[PDB]
Design a binder for this molecule. Structure first.
Ligand code: BMA
Length: 484
């Protein structure tokens, strides 16, 4: 049992700000989201082959305090408890991811039956408890074998490797999983993996592992798009009419607000949207890359053949938008001109304040600014720009510093205000015609936050890493109250 202050009843819990299920469309889904590597543990066990993150983690100094996700919050063994918390808090759904290398230790070939069994236990238990499973197929965890064989996303070989893996998952799990995502944040897979080397496999221009920031991110993104399209084709031709599910992709989207009303600032904000979201959503909706990207990046960007363009266009039933934050965008003056990096290709200036006033308070993470109206502007933008496609707001949340006690950690009033305000702004966008059908908080549990390790807590449930005990935060109860 914890210190007395743990059990103070935060009155913010009961201020739902006017929100309930009645403020949302009939059958609107409220969920939480996690990922295999961040929550499962058993990284080197249960027959799981290693991923790129397992080798990347081995360089000392990469994770703070050289922490690993070998155990993390141990959802492999504690999945029943986690599902029960989800149910008790009133959630309808859980978006989780399947570990490619847990099913295919070598990426292709032999199946790890022990991994298959785990996901079957997990899915069977969610169905038993009335939590809808939303399965994401890839969450930063490429099997290491594939990276060793042909450098993973940088080779056209990855496309059939992935499609076959997707295919197997549909065959095996699709009798009860009716909601699929191919990828989480392919932009990040490409940009962090191959532009700045911040994420595995740590490739970039200056990087230890080698790389080329001018070409490799574009090559990676191209094969991610082809792999998504190839996977969806399997689903549609072989499973969809029989299983009656749906398939989409999850795309991160930072809102870019023009800094001023000038043509140049307004154009800069559009350019950033092109490179951030358009990069993936233009091909999926129009069968082609953003014009700006083609004119700036020229031949450093691959092109789709006519056959590819047809496979890629309309290759979703819905799009998941992951949204956290917003920045101001400036025209940065005259552009160079000589290729440097995907990020430099955007040719923009970032701004985090205007007239001495910050755009929002900062969460723990260096990148996260709390800007509730950004979620409204983002959703309206995809509605207007893309013919109002069916959307899931597939991630939203914020982090506390990792190094806080149970007692301090559970009283997360800042997160309550975060969710109340963001969900209010999302509601306004729906009232004005946006076709959103679900919302997912990141995340249920404090977990392994990639390069930040355990110095960042995103959960609505506090996890003591010493004991692995769960303590619902005030924000979990805020949801419980709002959802009934
Ligand atoms: O930063 C919080 C979260 O944001 C998205 O990238 C998620 O898909 C996770 O990978 C991550 O933990």
């Amino acid at each position: 049992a914890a210190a007395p202050f743990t059990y103070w009843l935060n009155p913010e819990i009961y201020d739902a700000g006017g929100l309930s299920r009645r403020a949302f469309p009939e059958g609107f889904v409220f969920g939480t989201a996690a990922s295999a590597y961040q929550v499962e543990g058993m990284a080197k066990q249960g027959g799981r082959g290693p991923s790129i993150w397992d080798a990347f983690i081995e360089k000392p100094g990469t994770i703070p305090n050289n922490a690993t996700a070998d155990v993390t919050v141990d959802e492999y063994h504690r999945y029943k408890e986690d599902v029960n918390i989800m149910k008790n808090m009133g959630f309808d759904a859980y978006r989780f991811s399947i570990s490619w290398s847990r099913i295919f230790p070598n990426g292709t070939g032999m199946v790890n039956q022990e991994g298959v069994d785990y996901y079957n236990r997990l899915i069977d238990y969610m169905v038993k408890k009335g939590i809808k499973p939303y399965a994401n197929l890839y969450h930063y965890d490429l099997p290491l074998a594939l990276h060793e064989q042909y450098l993973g996303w940088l080779s056209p070989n990855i496309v059939e490797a992935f499609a076959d893996y997707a295919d197997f998952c549909f065959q095996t799990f699709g009798d009860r999983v009716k909601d699929w995502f191919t990828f989480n944040e392919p932009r990040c897979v490409a940009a962090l993996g191959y532009d700045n080397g911040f994420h595995a496999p740590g490739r970039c221009s200056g990087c230890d592992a080698g790389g080329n920031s001018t070409t490799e991110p574009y090559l990676a993104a191209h094969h991610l798009i082809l792999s998504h399209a190839a996977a969806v084709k399997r689903y549609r031709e072989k499973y969809q009419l029989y299983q009656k599910g749906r398939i989409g992709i999850l795309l991160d989207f930072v809102w870019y607000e023009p800094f001023s009303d000038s043509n140049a600032d307004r154009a800069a904000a559009q350019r950033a949207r092109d490179f951030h979201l358009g990069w993936f959503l233009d091909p999926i909706i129009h069968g082609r890359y953003p014009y700006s990207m083609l004119e700036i990046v020229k031949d450093r960007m691959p092109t789709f053949s006519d056959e590819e363009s047809r496979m890629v266009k309309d290759s979703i039933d819905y799009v998941g938008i992951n949204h956290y934050t917003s920045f101001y965008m400036k025209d940065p003056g005259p552009w160079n001109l000589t290729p440097t990096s995907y990020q430099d290709d955007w040719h923009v200036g970032f701004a985090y304040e205007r007239n001495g006033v910050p755009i929002g308070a900062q969460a723990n993470s260096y990148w996260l600014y709390i800007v509730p109206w950004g979620i409204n502007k983002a959703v309206t933008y995809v509605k207007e720009t893309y013919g109002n496609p069916t959307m899931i707001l597939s991630e939203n949340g914020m982090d506390q510093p990792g190094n806080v006690s149970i007692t301090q950690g559970v009283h997360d009033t800042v997160r309550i205000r975060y969710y109340r305000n963001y969900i209010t702004e999302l509601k306004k966008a729906i009232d004005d015609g946006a076709k959103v059908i679900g919302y997912f908080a990141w995340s249920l549990l404090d977990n392994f936050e990639w390069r930040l390790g355990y110095t960042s807590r995103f959960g609505i449930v506090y996890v003591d890493y010493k004991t692995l005990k769960r303590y619902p935060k005030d924000s979990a109860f805020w949801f419980k109250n709002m959802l009934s």
